[PDB]
Design a protein around this ligand. Structure first.
Ligand code: FBP
Lengths: 417, 409, 418, 402
C-alpha cells in the first residue's frame, strides 16, 4: 500500500516556507523586494516554485514566514495564492516574523499557530530557490528510514560548496558529519570534485521539531539557525538522515542532471532567466504534469508592429511575455517580462527586462538586467562600455549590468519609477 | 448620475447565446458562435459579458441552446468569480423570444425592474448604463439600440424609421427591399439586436406571445413590430453609449457573420492602429486566463533568426525562425522552421509543419499542418482541399486534413 | 497519493427521482435539499475532494438548472491549470425504442470524447443521488491490488429492500460470480438469509477498459445501455469484475457502528434521513472535521429566536434550525428547518422537514410532513392530524407522510406571492 | 457610477481597542467578533462592495494575524485584472497611510476614501462621493450629531456645508449652535482628492501624526474642508429611524450592540438583501437543539444561535451565541455574549457577561449574580458587565485545554 502511505503522508503534513530571505548578493534587485518575490521566467516569482511543489505533492496546508520587505510578497500571495477553501483543511497562511537580536527563530515565534495545525510531519522549505520536487516521495523516504529529521542533499561543485551545509553520510543514508558553510569544504569520498551539500529542505517529525525549537529558544549559545545550530545537534544525536534529491526531483528527461538554482548572485539570476530562452532549456516550464502556477493577469497577446520606417522585426532565442509591444527592433537571447515596451530601432541582446520596462527609440542593451518599470531614454547604450556602465549603474565582476529606477533618476532621466 | 447608478442595480442582462453561426461554415460546427475564438485569447461572448460588468450590471443570464459544452465550460472557467449573496451572478439558462419565455419563472425571481436583452455573438464595446438612462428619460417601454448601416447590407437587419424625437414609427424585420432613411438614402437605420425593457411589461408581452397566435416567437419578427404599432417603442443611437478611445472615429460594431468578416476582424488587432482598442484599461475585456508560458521564439534548424511584421503571438507559442506577417496566432501555436505565414489566423494548438506557406487563411483549432503544405497561392487547389470563400479566404479544419490523408493524431 | 492523482470521478447526476413525487418535479434528485443546508450531490463531490480526486465530471440530464446553478455557486473554485476541475457534462435523453429509454452508461458514452481528453488511468463512477461518506482512495488501492478491471462497491442490505439494487454473489477471492439487476425475488446471502449482498452503484474502472466497453455497448442493439442491467453482467460473465466491501472505505467516527448509506428513494426515507440528524445520536456524523461536507455557503444571519406576539418563550426539542431562520415562540419538535424559514407565533411543528424559505403563518400545526421550498402556509392551517383531509389537499404517502408544495397550496386558493 | 470607479478605499485597521480590555488581548479591534458570525471590519468592507468601490487597501499594524487570516479566507475572491482587489498593507493614523504611499500611488486613483475599520455602520459611500464632487471640496468629512457628554471622544466641528472650526477630542466640547444638548462630531470617515492627499501627507511627514489631530485642522484653516451629513448616505430600511453608528469603544457598548441584534426589533438590520454584510462563511452544521440529560426540552427568548452550536435543553434569554458554542444540560444563559467555540458545562448560570473565544466554563459555575465574586475572578465593568477569558479561568485552576 505504498500508494496509501503516499497519500496519507502529505495529508498529515504541513509545509513551512521560509520567505524572509534578504538576498543581499542580488544588490539593488532586492532593495525593495524579498528574494522570494523576485521576478523569474517572464511571469513568475521565485516563491511560486516552492508553493507549486507543495500543491503538486499533495501538501495543501502551507505557512509562509516573511521578515524582509514583505509588502510585494504578501500582495503576490493575496492575488495568486488565495484560492483555498479552508474548511477542507487547505490553506496558505501568512506568518509574519520579526527580526530579533536566525531561520529557526522565525518558526519558533509562530510556534503557537503551528501547533494548532496538529500536523504529524513538518516540511521546512526555502522559498528563494528554483526547482521542482515531489515532497511526497521525500516524506515516504523519511518514514521508511525511521528518521526524526530528513535533509535533502545533492552533490555540488566543491568550489561552490562553501555557501551550503556540507555532510557525510552512512551506508543507510544517515548523516555522520555535518559542517555549515565551511571555508574549506570536505569533498565526497568517491569524488574530490564534488561535495555533498544540504539543499535547505527538511522533513521533521512534528513533535520532535517542537521540542527541538523549545530547547533552542532556551539556549543562549545558539544563533537559532537550522543549519548552523539545529542540524549539527540532530546529527550528533544520530537522528538525522539524508535524502538524495534525484529520488524526488521532477524532470521530464530522466537522463539530465537534477535542476536546482539558488539564484544567489546577479550573474546567476541573469543566467537562470536566459536558460529558458535557449533552444533546450534546463528547466522545463512546459510540463503539464508538474505545473507551476502564479498570479495570472489578463494581459493582451504579445504585439509585434512595424517600426517608424515601416520595417519588420527580428527575434532570436527570446521570450516575449503578454502585454508587450515591440516595434521592429532586434531581440536576441533575451527574456521580456509582462507589459514591456520596446520602441523602434532597438537592439536587445542577452538582456532580462522586468515587467513594465519602457525602452526608448534607438537603444542598445547588452548583458544586463533592467529592473521593474524602468524608463530607458531614447538612444541610451548599455553593455558596450564597461567604464561608462559602472559609472551610471551597477556592474558585476562578470560584466553583467543592473539598471534601477533610482539609478536612471540620479542621471537626470525622468522616470515614473 | 444618481439615476445612473441605481439603474443597473435594478437591471438584469439576458444574453442570447444560442446562435448557430451557420454563415461561418465549419468554424461553428462544433462550437456555438458566442464560443468562437477571437483576439488571440478571447471568445466572442466575453465582450457582451465584459460590457455588462463595466456598465455596473453584475446580474447576467446566459441562455445557451446550441453547442453548449465549450461555451458552458468557458463560463465556468472564466466567468464564475461571483458572490451571489452580493446580488451578482452569471446564470446558465439552458433552453429568440421563446428561449426567454421558457425561463420566465427563473427570470421573474430575479425581481428586476429593467431587463437588458443582448446578442452574445457580436463584438463591440457599449456602456449599457447610458442606454438605461436614455430608456428612462424617454419614458419608453422598449428601447432599441440602432445604428446606420449600408443599405445594400440592410436586408440582414431589422430596419426602423423614427419619429421627431427617437420614437419608433415603422419597423420591418429583414426586408428584401430595405427602406432608406429620409435624411440619407445611402444608409438604412438598422436594429443592433440590443434592447432595454421595462421588466413587468416584457413579462406580459412574452405571456401574450406564447398564447397567440402563429408567431415565430422572435424579438425582431414578432415582438418589436407589436410594440412599435402600440407606439411604446423608442430608439437609442449607438454613439450615445458606444465606448471608444478616439471620439473622432466611427462606432465599432462587428457581427462577424461571414468567414471573411471574421478573418478581417481578427487581423485588425494585428495592425499598427487597430479599430478595436484592446489596450484600454478603462473598459477592459476579461476572459479565462490560463497560465501559459511566455511566447517563445527560437532559431530555426539552420541557426537563423525569425522575422515578425504586424503580428500577434499568444502565450504558449513556439516559433522557430520563419516569417510572420499580418497574422494572429492563438494560444499554444507551434510554427516549425522555414515557414512563411501571411495574413493568417491560427486558432489555438495549431501545429504547423516545416517549410509551410500559409496566406489569407483561417486555421481551425488543433490542426496539424503537414510539412511543406502551401495554402493561399493556388485558388483551384485550395478550393479542392478545403473551403474557399468568394473573396478568396481559406478555412482549414482537422477533418479536411484527415480526408486529405495526413492524420491529426 | 499517485493513485487518486491518476483518477477521474464521473458523477451520474441525471436521476429523475420519480419516487420522490413532487419533490423532483422541478429539480433533479441530486439537487434535492438535505441536512438543513446541503444538496444530495454535495456528498459525492465532497467525498471526491477528501479522497484526493480533484478532477470531476458531473453528468446532468433531468431538470438541471438548479443543479448546474448549485455547481456554479458552490463547486466552481478550482484552478484548472493544476489539473483540478468540476466539469459540467450535459447529456440528452435518447431512446432505443418506442418506450425504451437509454440508461446510465449511454450518458457517459455521449461525453466519451471529452472524457478521453482527461487522459485518466482510472475512472470512478459515482451515483450523485445517494448520501454517504466514503474514501475512494482506499477503494482505488483495493482495485489495483486485486488486479481487477472493474471493482464494484458492495454492502449487505435487508432482503426486503434488495429488489431496488443489483444483487451479487462473490468468491473467497472476492470475484463476482453471479449478478442480477433489481430482482423481484432477491437472492439471499449464503451466511445470512435475512440480507442480500447489494451493489451500491459505485464502480472503479480501468480507464482504457471502460472506453472499449462503452464503444462496444454503443454498437450493441440489444443493450439498454445501463451500467447495472448491461455492463456489470457482461464484465461478471467475463470474470473481470470484483467486489469491494463498503466498510473497507466507509468513513465513520465510531468504528463500532454500522456503515451509513442512504439511497433516499422514497418520500418516507427522505423524511426519515433528514430527521436522523435532529436526533440525540445521529447515525450520520456531520460534525467530523476530518471528513467535511462542503456546499454553497451563503452569508446568512444567525438563526433568530424571538418572543411570540404575547411575549412568551419558544420551546425546542431535538430540532435543527438553519441560518436566516426567524422563529416567533412556537414549539418545534423533532424537526429540521432549512435556511430562511419563517415560523410565526403560536405554531406547533412536529416531525417536520421545512425546505428553504418556507413561511409558516400564525397558529399553524404541522406534523409528519415535508414542506417544499418557499411554501407560504396560511394562518391557522393544520397538517398531519386528519388523514383523509390531508390526502385531499396534498400528497400523503402510504406511511402517512404528507408532502406540501406551492402548487398544491395555490389550487386550494392560498396565495404564494412573495 | 464613474465616481466610485475612480476611487480607492483605505481602511485603517490598526486600532488597538484598549478600552475593550482583554477582548483585544491577542486581537485587533477590527477583528473583534460581532453579530454571531461576523467581525467588525466586515462592515466597512461590505459597505465598499455595495457602494461600487471594489478596490480596497486594508492597513494593519496591531496583533494582525487573525485579521490577516480573516481577510485571506473571506475577502480574497477578487479578480484583480478587472481592477478589483483587497490588498493587505502592513504598517499616528496618517503615518500608516504615508508609509504605504508608494503602493497607493500605483493604484492611480482619483479619489481616496479613508475609513475606520473598527466601527459598525451601514453607509453608501457612492452618495458621499457625489456630495464631495458637487461641493467642490478637497476633503469631505462625514459628520453626525452626538450627545455633548460623549463628544470629548470625537473630533468636533462647526460649519457654515463648509468647515469653519475644528477641535480634536476637546475636554470641553463646543455645542452645536442650534442645540446645546449635542455636538457635531466627526465620524472618522473622509473622502479625499487623491493628488491633494498625497501632497498633504508628504508635507506632514516632513513636519517635525493623526488625521484628526493634525491634518483636518490644517485643511480647515485652509478653507478646503467640507462636511457630509451622515443621514445623506446612511443606509437604513426604516427612514423614520435614527442613523445607526456604533464605535463599540467600551465593553458595555460592545455587549450592548451585540444584544441589540437579539431583540424583537433590532436597530441594526442584518436582514436587508439590498445591503448585505459578507464575511468568512464556513460550512457549519445547522444549529442543533437536543434534549437535556433528563430528556427535557429547551427554551429560547429573544436569542441568536449561530451555526455549529449544540444546545442541550437549557434556557437562553436575550443572548447571542457565536459559532460552535456548546451549552450543556441544565444551563441558564441571560443577557450574555458567547464568542466562538465556548464550552459551557452543565448547570451553569451566566448573566450580563461576555465570554471570550474558546472558554471552557466548568460545571456549575455562576457568573453575573455576585458582584464581588465576579470582580475577584474576572473583569467587571462599572456598569456590571463581566468579561471572562481563558487566561482568567486557567488562573483559577480550571483547565482550558482542549
Ligand atoms: O409555484 P412555482 O412554480 O414554484 O413558481 C412561483 C409562482 O408563485 C407565484 O408567487 C404566484 O403565486 P400566487 O399568485 O398564487 O400568489 C409567482 O412567483 C409564480 O407564478
Amino acid at each position: 500500500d505504498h500508494l496509501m502511505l503516499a497519500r496519507q503522508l502529505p495529508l498529515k503534513s504541513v509545509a513551512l516556507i521560509l520567505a524572509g530571505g534578504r538576498g543581499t548578493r542580488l544588490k539593488d534587485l532586492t532593495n525593495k523586494r524579498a528574494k522570494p518575490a523576485v521576478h523569474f521566467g517572464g511571469k513568475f516569482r521565485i516563491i511560486d516554485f516552492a508553493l507549486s511543489n507543495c500543491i503538486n505533492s499533495g501538501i495543501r496546508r502551507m505557512g509562509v514566514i516573511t521578515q524582509y520587505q514583505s509588502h510585494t510578497l504578501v500582495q503576490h500571495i493575496q492575488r495568486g495564492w488565495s484560492f483555498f477553501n479552508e474548511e477542507m483543511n487547505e490553506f496558505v497562511d501568512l506568518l509574519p516574523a520579526q527580526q530579533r537580536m536566525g531561520t529557526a527563530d522565525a518558526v519558533t515565534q509562530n510556534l503557537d499557530i503551528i501547533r494548532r495545525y496538529k500536523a504529524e510531519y513538518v516540511v521546512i522549505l526555502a522559498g528563494d530557490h528554483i526547482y521542482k520536487q515531489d515532497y511526497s516521495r521525500m516524506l515516504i523516504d523519511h518514514v521508511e528510514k525511521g528518521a526524526r529529521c530528513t535533509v535533502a542533499c545533492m552533490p555540488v561543485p566543491i568550489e561552490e560548496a562553501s555557501a551550503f551545509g556540507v555532510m557525510a553520510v552512512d551506508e543507510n543514508d544517515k548523516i555522520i558529519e555535518f559542517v555549515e558553510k565551511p571555508a574549506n569544504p570536505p569533498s565526497m569520498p568517491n569524488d574530490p570534485s564534488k561535495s555533498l551539500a544540504s539543499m535547505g529542505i527538511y522533513v521533521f517529525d512534528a513533535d520532535y521539531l517542537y521540542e527541538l525549537l523549545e530547547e533552542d529558544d532556551r539556549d543562549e549559545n545558539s544563533s537559532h539557525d537550522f543549519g548552523k545550530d539545529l542540524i549539527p545537534k540532530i546529527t550528533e544525536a544520530g537522528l538525522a538522515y539524508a535524502h538524495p534529491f534525484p529520488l524526488s526531483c521532477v524532470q521530464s528527461d530522466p537522463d539530465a542532471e537534477p535542476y536546482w538554482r539558488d539564484v544567489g548572485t546577479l550573474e546567476a539570476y541573469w543566467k537562470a532567466n536566459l536558460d529558458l530562452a535557449s533552444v533546450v532549456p534546463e528547466l522545463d516550464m512546459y510540463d503539464r504534469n508538474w505545473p507551476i502556477r502564479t498570479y495570472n493577469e489578463s494581459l493582451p497577446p504579445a504585439k509585434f508592429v512595424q517600426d517608424r520606417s515601416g520595417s519588420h522585426g527580428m527575434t532570436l532565442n527570446s521570450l516575449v511575455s503578454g502585454g508587450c509591444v515591440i516595434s521592429g527592433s532586434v531581440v536576441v537571447q533575451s527574456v521580456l517580462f509582462s507589459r514591456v515596451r520596446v520602441n523602434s530601432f532597438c537592439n536587445i541582446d542577452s538582456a532580462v527586462l522586468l515587467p513594465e520596462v519602457w525602452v526608448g527609440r534607438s537603444c542598445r542593451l547588452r548583458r544586463c538586467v533592467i529592473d521593474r518599470a524602468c524608463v530607458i531614454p531614447e538612444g541610451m547604450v548599455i553593455g558596450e562600455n564597461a567604464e561608462e556602465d559602472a559609472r551610471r549603474f551597477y556592474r558585476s565582476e562578470e560584466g553583467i549590468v543592473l539598471v534601477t529606477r533610482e539609478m536612471l533618476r540620479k542621471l537626470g532621466h525622468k522616470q515614473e519609477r
